[PDB]
mmCIF file of C-alpha atoms in Angstrom:
data_model
loop_
_atom_site.group_PDB
_atom_site.id
_atom_site.type_symbol
_atom_site.label_atom_id
_atom_site.label_comp_id
_atom_site.label_asym_id
_atom_site.label_seq_id
_atom_site.Cartn_x
_atom_site.Cartn_y
_atom_site.Cartn_z
ATOM 1 C CA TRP A 1 41.908 125.157 74.016
ATOM 2 C CA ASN A 2 42.825 122.256 76.859
ATOM 3 C CA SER A 3 43.416 118.239 76.895
ATOM 4 C CA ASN A 4 46.418 118.009 74.294
ATOM 5 C CA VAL A 5 47.833 114.910 75.666
ATOM 6 C CA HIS A 6 46.453 111.143 75.410
ATOM 7 C CA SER A 7 48.925 108.727 77.103
ATOM 8 C CA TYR A 8 47.067 105.371 76.069
ATOM 9 C CA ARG A 9 48.431 102.173 77.096
ATOM 10 C CA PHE A 10 46.504 98.809 76.785
#
């Protein structure tokens, strides 16, 4: 399991 964080600013 990998890549759990999304920080998404728009």
